[PDB]
Design a protein around this ligand. Sequence first.
Ligand code: NP1
Length: 118
Amino acid sequence: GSHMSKEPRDPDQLYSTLKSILQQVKSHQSAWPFMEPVKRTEAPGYYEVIRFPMDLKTMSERLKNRYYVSKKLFMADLQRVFTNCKEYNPPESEYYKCANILEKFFFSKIKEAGLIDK
Ligand SMILES: Cc1ccc(NCCCN)c([N+](=O)[O-])c1
């Protein structure tokens, strides 16, 4: 294309462009802490430090029914998983580590697919 290329635009192209990302992030090495949603008490405080508990257990599931078909929409979700993990997980646990790793891959991935609502 010419200029303004970074953009999913077509809601049919983004359906898979988002799918591939969520699929790679899951297979990635920093996605095991987000696959299963943490328990309500298993965490030091997930019912407060995190007002929007969002993990990978809902992303693909919602994408299965094209529930996620927008830039800031999917971005915010995954971006919510990394920030959420770093939110409850203090600067001294594996959750923060992988959160920074996956977030790195994710960003580079969305930057390539032409997503990133920022
Ligand atoms: C706070 C907390 C709660 C639970 C878990 N375990 C994974 C929770 C979904 N199986 C972790 N963690 O670092 O794996 C942290």
